[PDB]
Design a protein around this ligand. Structure first.
Ligand code: NAG
Lengths: 99, 31, 99, 49
């Protein structure tokens, strides 16, 4: 080391510079963090998008079903819709715990 | 640090306020 | 006689003679804008809209933008401000005051 | 404007099956349009439709 101190420092700083340029050049060099953030946000996006599905019920807007049908049949209709949303949220939670 | 700012502005983070309207907010990170 | 009803998102033509009332702003209300039985505060913006339609959807897949059935006017529904409560509390023996 | 509250009130209706929505709730929702298909059928096949 003491035979090559200045050379070591020079190489070190040139390496710092090449790191600067390599990072600032392309986005996909930093890939793991982008992978994790995209996976989480995309899973959450699928979760929130799932609310648009009627799951076999009359519609997806719950308030529309409340306005349309009577409680003695809104019972079964909302039962189907809630069990569907519950299943979707449950699989989301399990995959969230996996990650 | 200098490299840190490159890294911050190179990661794009997320509609987002529409999620808050349906319960599933994002809790703030502690640190 | 069979009365076939195609309830959907469209210009409201025929419905019951329930008494209408004027609007309010910055106060969340249990509005019913021709089946749109949601809740929230009503504001305005500068956005465009179809000449005849009454519904404005979002990525969350719910009605966000509305046109009044009486006077054609652009309205923004933002559901009444809400969040969650976090009861910060020390050990029960330590104290009974909670933040 | 349709007085769907009072149309239901006529006791002549012997087979009143509202598969779409509950009868008393006909009053609130606003219909995009409406089909009114009228005819007369046999007394036996009243519930085949
Ligand atoms: C009473 O509260 C104090 C608060 O620190 C705690 O240390 C103590 O253990 C409590 N007493 C009992 C009997 O648990």
């Amino acid at each position: 080391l003491y035979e090559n101190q200045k050379l070591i420092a020079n190489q070190f700083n040139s390496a710092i510079g090449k790191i600067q340029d390599s990072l600032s050049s392309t986005a996909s060099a930093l890939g793991k963090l982008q992978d994790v953030v995209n996976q989480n946000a995309q899973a959450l996006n699928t979760l929130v998008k799932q609310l648009s599905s009627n799951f076999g019920a009359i519609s997806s807007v719950l308030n529309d079903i409340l306005s349309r049908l009577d409680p003695p049949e809104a019972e079964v209709q909302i039962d189907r819709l809630i069990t569907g949303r519950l299943q979707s949220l449950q699989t989301y939670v399990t995959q969230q715990l996996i990650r | 640090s200098f490299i840190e700012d490159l890294l911050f502005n190179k990661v794009t983070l997320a509609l987002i306020c529409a999620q808050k309207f349906n319960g599933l907010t994002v809790l703030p990170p502690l640190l | 006689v069979v009365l076939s009803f195609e309830l959907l998102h469209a210009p409201a033509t025929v419905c019951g003679p329930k008494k209408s009332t004027n609007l309010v702003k910055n106060k969340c209300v249990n509005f019913n804008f021709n089946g749109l039985t949601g809740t929230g505060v009503l504001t305005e913006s500068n956005k465009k809209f179809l000449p005849f339609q009454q519904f404005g959807r979002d990525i969350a897949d719910t009605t966000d933008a509305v046109r009044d059935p009486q006077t054609l006017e652009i309205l923004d529904i933002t559901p009444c401000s809400f969040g969650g409560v976090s009861v910060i509390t020390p050990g029960t023996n330590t104290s009974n005051q909670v933040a | 404007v349709a007085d769907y509250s009072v149309l239901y009130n006529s006791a002549s209706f012997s087979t009143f099956k509202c598969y779409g929505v509950s009868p008393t709730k006909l009053n609130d929702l606003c219909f995009t349009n409406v089909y009114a298909d009228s005819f007369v059928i046999r007394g036996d096949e009243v519930r085949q439709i």
